Structure 1
């Protein structure tokens, strides 16, 4: 059986001639994915592996579009060809299942659909046989993070030959000798175990499902589908970025009117704890006090921020909070945090409190209190909550029905279901969720639009204490790996880079000041933190104006140019909402450790309109190690027929507001 993208460049062949059912993929008539197996092994049920033959193929197609309530673009186009291939094996130990493939111009998605059939009752998947066999893997280059490690998704990316990527998380991005870029991921991860990729024979990446502590991967009763497995394919790195395939493979919004989900910018009592000017726990340096929170709310009201995150407000942080998962209360504030007074103050100032539920990995202690915790926040005029699951890989703690503790993975079926329960319960309270230590993004924000963002990668916090901090190349890695999954709460915008001393050997963001501004356009998130202490913004009002101006919700986004681990340039048009007219464009560009010159056409600007470009760029002598603050801000009249030369310093960047003129 064969299905092709609408433009014909991607061709999938589904076969039953190999030991199992299999598929392969060509791009512009060159094989990029060799014969790759399909099937399942179960704990007790007979396997779905060899001796299955194709009995039926059903071809359909889609050419439609839909509108996002919020996002990186307003209108999402869905154009794909689709084939459902049915396989059957005669008795004994026979069975039937189908695989549905969707072929887009930008990539492929497929999933298994296992129907009701005799003997398929309570089953436990122990292995998914799905492969991604990369052709010519010996000359391919990959940019990847290890899976099943002690620090979850929070690793810097490795640059290696593809054959050295032994066990990796997704999105898993690489390029072949021809320059074709490919990224493997999944979409709509619901009631199933996350897929890790396990390189078997050279170039053959096998699905490796993250298991329960008992050892099985996925528990199902009867008929079941898998999540989508996705293979993005493009001739250029930015062709991976500019795809909507992940959203397009998710189910439509199930929450109805979600106008109560509000993109915007926020600040927080947060960074001070990471740089040790405050503590989460009680005492003379406690960050989460009534007085401190009102001070932040006053600043947010004056400078245009919607909310103030406050961590350390609830009892349980005293001591070493990493070990306090058993004792956190999610309803009882410390005596110096007056939540009723702050609720009144939020109504006076128009600035909301952003809630915080750190579990330190004990999800049963949280689940027990969750309904009361969200009821408190709904009563307290709280619309957004940051959650946390801080524990090493494989050390989620749950208490089972017999009162016995079990350790689980953050990305097993158990936690996949635990995260979605939290999001669905929050939605009943009109609360949106920002998940730190999350399951990776698989597009579920389409279906549940209150799941607004997540961490799930190294963000700004590692630049306070990472030892080492994130390297200069980190953003240009994230843009073509982590960010292919969806929005990230990176917490950009550190203006004081000197708190541990300058140079290349201290814990600090290893960037220039202008690169910190560029992050608001390079790294998409519907909520964007201005992460620094307020006084550090007051010290640099000219640079701070860009953060005050920049929106977080876009009617269109375009990655204009870039290369994995080297640089990225984004242009985005603001969505008409709140104070934003919908007429302004914004641009952000960042580089890695190298200074880089990038020529850009401005033909993304609307035809026939004049813009005033407000350009925030690295100064003449800027250099991230010892001269990161040199900054030039200039205004230039431009139209779509103009060009721009970006001159990025070492670990530098540029941020531009294109202000439409009336």
Structure 2
């Protein structure tokens, strides 16, 4: 029995080494997590955790700053008390107690190669608490191998642990409401070459249990235009290990106010350190995206589509407003060939890249999984040398050891040729952006692309106020916002070629502050942006990377207000759910000089016409108390310079 407390002493975990290896969690004297078992089963029969044999322990207290480029601040504070448990048989379990979380990880110091059959990571709660979880969207109930093949894109289901579907997996992160304002957010970081952790309500009462996708023994090409490698057969173990190594951290974020949940840096702090020395070539920025708006420009003299004159228009729009990139989404490579070297007749990559270059615009290429990793080294070298700045690799739809290994290999391969990377059709970041700073964004989020086909029952507005406290806890999101067509309550309808967002114009603007996206999209058509000078100017100028971030206030699934600083310029964004609300922005975070503010707030009719907004300018200072009204599904965006 070993105790460890957070630096402020209000969060503690008791670890017991008995017939089972368990750890609980107590917050301000209240037990929010009952003793929960953890273990790893090897192919040789060994089971770390079962009647474990303790050989030694070492404690430590650390307080330092971790550099965090292309993220929410220049650096993040790493403050905790660590407890490492060494066990007879060359294996350890490291425990850390931060003021906002308890985390642990298995460490393999053994020198002999072996395999992991299964891993146990239970979360036993003292009562039937209300959980907010993202179910795996595909597959059928009970057929877990059917579920392992998924996009990791889904809204949240909020219900009591006892009422959760006991036959459907839940991916991370997820939250459990411990009551009395306390929240527990479960996630994992440093997910390199190891299967992703799913949670299940299939076992016991008030208990979430883990499960991992088995190792693949036979994969076949197929899926989305033959760009996917489906797992047809799997091994009887989840992971291969042939060197000493740290295993992924299992993180239990614990907060007493929702704003601390949205602000927690645990995911990044627990990611494997950066393996990059030179970062001067990594350029974060925005994209005059093409796909979301379906190339649907109007007011032009040529037929739009995946062709040269269309991308020239996107490049010109981007350049005209200082926007950094233009992505050539799915369509530039001959379909079904899964060959990145076969460009369509209508596209002249070389001409586009060079034209873009003369306009100070970088080019990013979209690539389906298989077509990219089948000849990765050659692809990265070839396009890097012709001028391409990076890739958007999509449709992995897997998180078994081989795929998670891929994420890091691609990250490294891109880094080698000075290319940035954006991963789609993937799972939560889990620290990868710290290890390889060139991976500027990750999907694994039910983004605005869903508005192209979702039925009105999909509550995007509600989702927006959920993810800042859940999915974003794991890392950056490529949500792809920026819609100029805005639907107030009941006016939304899926429109593939002329999509809209739910809520108001200012909600869209606020997301550029509320959501963290180093590589950020301007989802709408340049045509729509040019019809909206004021909105476009605000979006084009706002940073995607920051020096300092402060979540001013918030309640999960209800609202959030966040202030971020870039140099000496401050930005504040706020959003609400379908309920209108009045927020007060205390500007005590400002410096001493006199500032000029530019505010975008919902128009007085934003509740009936979502596009309705009002722009205002006025002087403001450190003592200012800005009162702002947010319409239903609305929000506000503020610039203080």
What is the TM-score normalised by the length of structure 2?
0.89
* Aligned: 1:316 with 2:301: no
Q: Quick one: distance in 1 between partners of 2:431 and 2:624? A: 36
The equivalences for 1:77-226 within 5 A come to 77-88=77-88, 95=89, 97-116=91-110, 121-136=112-127, 138=128, 140-147=129-136, 149-150=138-139, 151-165=150-164, 166=166, 167-199=169-201, 200-212=203-215, 213-221=234-242, 223-226=244-247
Contact 1:274 1:465 in 2 (8 A): no
Q: Quick one: distance in 1 between partners of 2:547 and 2:260? A: 19
Q: How far did residue 64 of structure 1 move?
A: 1.3
Q: How far did residue 144 of structure 1 move?
A: 1.2
Partner of 2:382: 376
The equivalences for 1:308-457 within 5 A come to 308-317=326-335, 324=336, 327-359=337-369, 363=370, 365-389=371-395, 410-457=398-445
Q: Quick one: distance in 2 between partners of 1:588 and 1:307? A: 24
**Which is worse superposed, 336-345 or 149-158?**
149-158
Q: Structure 1 residues 482, 290: CA separation in 2 closer, same or farther (over 3 Å shift)?
A: same
Q: Deviations for 1:542-585, whole angstroms, at most 9, x for unmatched residues?
A: 222211221111101111111111111110001xxxxxxx1110
Secondary structure of 2:199's aligned partner:
strand
Q: Deviations for 1:3-53, whole angstroms, at most 9, x for unmatched residues?
A: 111111111111123x31111111111111110112122344233343224
Q: Deviations for 1:177-207, whole angstroms, at most 9, x for unmatched residues?
A: 2220110111101111111112221222222
Q: Structure 1 residues 271, 614: CA separation in 2 closer, same or farther (over 3 Å shift)?
A: same
* Aligned: 1:22 with 2:22: yes
Q: Quick one: distance in 1 between partners of 2:364 and 2:428? A: 22
Contact 2:485 2:501 in 1 (8 A): no
Q: How far did residue 152 of structure 1 move?
A: 2.8
Q: Quick one: distance in 2 between partners of 1:527 and 1:6? A: 35
Q: Deviations for 1:516-546, whole angstroms, at most 9, x for unmatched residues?
A: 1111001011121111000101111122221
Secondary structure of 1:38's aligned partner:
strand
Q: Quick one: distance in 1 between partners of 2:53 and 2:45? A: 19
Q: Quick one: distance in 1 between partners of 2:170 and 2:32? A: 19
Q: Structure 1 residues 224, 553: CA separation in 2 closer, same or farther (over 3 Å shift)?
A: closer
What is the TM-score normalised by the length of structure 1?
0.87
Q: Deviations for 1:586-610, whole angstroms, at most 9, x for unmatched residues?
A: 011111111122222111112x122
Partner of 1:530: 522
**Which is worse superposed, 500-509 or 45-54?**
500-509
* Aligned: 1:614 with 2:601: no
Q: Quick one: distance in 1 between partners of 2:430 and 2:206? A: 24
Partner of 1:58: 58
Q: Quick one: distance in 1 between partners of 2:409 and 2:138? A: 25
Q: Structure 1 residues 380, 288: CA separation in 2 closer, same or farther (over 3 Å shift)?
A: farther
Q: How far did residue 505 of structure 1 move?
A: 4.6
Contact 2:288 2:317 in 1 (8 A): no
Q: Deviations for 1:388-423, whole angstroms, at most 9, x for unmatched residues?
A: 116xx6xxxxxxxxxxxxxxxx11101001121111
* Aligned: 1:491 with 2:492: no
Q: Which runs of 5+ in 2 are unaligned?
A: 140-149, 216-233
**Which is worse superposed, 165-174 or 431-440?**
165-174
Partner of 2:320: 302
Contact 1:289 1:313 in 2 (8 A): no
Contact 2:481 2:508 in 1 (8 A): yes
Aligned partner of 1:588 among 573, 583, 588 = 573
